[PDB]
Design a protein around this ligand. Structure first.
Ligand SMILES: O=C(O)C[C@H](NC(=O)c1ncnc2[nH]ccc12)c1cccnc1
Length: 167
């Protein structure tokens, strides 16, 4: 039994809610919140900008030190950093940004990072401003992640679309 509540059960291991991932994190304080990152960990807008804003820019400060030491992530890759005031840990996962020309086949690789954590609060990778088909991303999530994932879908109309079309 965990602290996630009000989520629709989609599958044996995937739950979904129409909610802002930032607000869910402050309420639940999960062990792991997933950030929809870019390879440079530049958290300017979208999910990343919103999480970072909620950390008072501490996420960005930590991320800049990480990049200075380690260089950029790979598309499809991840790193574990602090969750600051939102979670114990933040798993920064880079899904392909279709609006940047990044290959959509890497979405499965991106979701595989979730399997290293028993329970996660996570956004729909590559959806929204990342430019990929959100129905497809959900199919990849359900077909790739085996650990317990709680998905927070921000856009109300998107959420309604995803539930009503889920196979
Ligand atoms: O679920 C959605 O609608 C799409 C989701 N977007 C957000 O979660 C989001 N976007 C902008 N501002 C925000 N503030 C708090 C949350 C948030 C998303 C998923 C993957 C990549 N980029 C975006």
């Amino acid at each position: 039994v965990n602290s996630f509540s009000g989520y629709l059960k989609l599958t044996d291991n995937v739950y979904i809610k129409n909610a802002d991932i930032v607000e869910e994190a402050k309420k639940v304080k999960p062990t792991v919140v997933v950030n929809a990152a870019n390879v440079y960990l530049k958290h300017g807008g979208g999910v990343a900008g919103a999480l970072n804003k909620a950390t008072n820019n501490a996420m960005q400060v930590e991320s800049d030190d990480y990049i200075a030491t380690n260089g950029p992530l790979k598309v499809g890759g991840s790193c574990v950093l602090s969750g600051h005031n939102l979670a114990k840990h933040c798993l920064h996962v880079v899904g392909p940004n279709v609006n940047k020309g990044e290959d959509i086949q890497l979405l499965k690789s991106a979701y595989e990072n979730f399997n290293q954590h028993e329970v996660l609060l996570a956004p729909l990778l590559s959806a929204g401003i990342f430019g990929a088909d959100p129905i497809h991303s959900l199919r990849v999530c359900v077909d790739t992640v085996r650990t317990n994932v709680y998905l927070a879908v921000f856009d109300k109309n998107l959420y309604d679309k995803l539930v009503s079309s889920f196979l």
